[PDB]
From a paper:
SK catalyzes the specific phosphorylation of the 3-hydroxyl group of shikimic acid, using ATP as a co-substrate. The shikimate pathway is comprised of seven enzymatic components that convert erythrose 4-phosphate and phosphoenolpyruvate into chorismate, for subsequent synthesis of aromatic compounds. SKs belong to a class of P-loop kinases that share a homologous α-β-α fold. Overall, these structures have a characteristic α-β-α fold that consists of the CORE domain (residues 1–31, 61–108, and 124–162), the SB domain (residues 32–60), and the LID region (residues 109–123) in the monomer.
Residue numbers in the entry: 2 to 161
Amino acid sequence: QHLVLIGFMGSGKSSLAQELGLALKLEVLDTDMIISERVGLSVREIFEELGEDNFRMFEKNLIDELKTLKTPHVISTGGGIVMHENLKGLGTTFYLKMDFETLIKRLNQKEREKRPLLNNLTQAKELFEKRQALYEKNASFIIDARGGLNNSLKQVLQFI
Ligand SMILES: Nc1ncnc2c1ncn2[C@@H]1O[C@H](COP(=O)(O)OP(=O)(O)O)[C@@H](O)[C@H]1O
Ligand SMILES: O=C(O)C1=C[C@@H](OP(=O)(O)O)[C@@H](O)[C@H](O)C1
């Protein structure tokens, strides 16, 4: 049973998780990072060259794989990780709740361009709207990710 951060693009998982693992002396994993590196392509290049369904298969399979990990880990998650039925039972999951506009504001241009599902913003907005219920139903605890990192850190630690 790990500590799994979940949240739409730009909700600050990757760095939170890194802070969390330092404070708790646990190993940090990042699902995008793991797939990226096995396949030797960036997530964008994966979408572009191999198509989203394959990325989705990689994601879906890493879920199952990480369940066979022994040591509690901190695990940072890609936006879309909540679409997967099998996410249930991986770890106590912490949802980095923000609102579309705050979320978007803090991704510089280069940084948006790393995320294929931000190519069309109107579409990015409906995705947010749809994903909301999938975060909520996969969340052990909901965290107000609006303030700084510490403020999200504080809230997470409070839930042990
Ligand atoms: N408290 C915070 N709330 C939201 N975003 C933050 C916060 N603190 C830092 N960030 C920003 O989040 C940006 C992108 O999120 P990141 O850390 O990559 O996690 P994610 O995997 O959810 O995209 C970082 O480049 C950083 O500037
Ligand atoms: O929400 C999604 O479908 C995705 C979000 C991205 O993760 P980040 O939350 O690190 O930007 C990455 O997994 C990919 O572009 C798909």
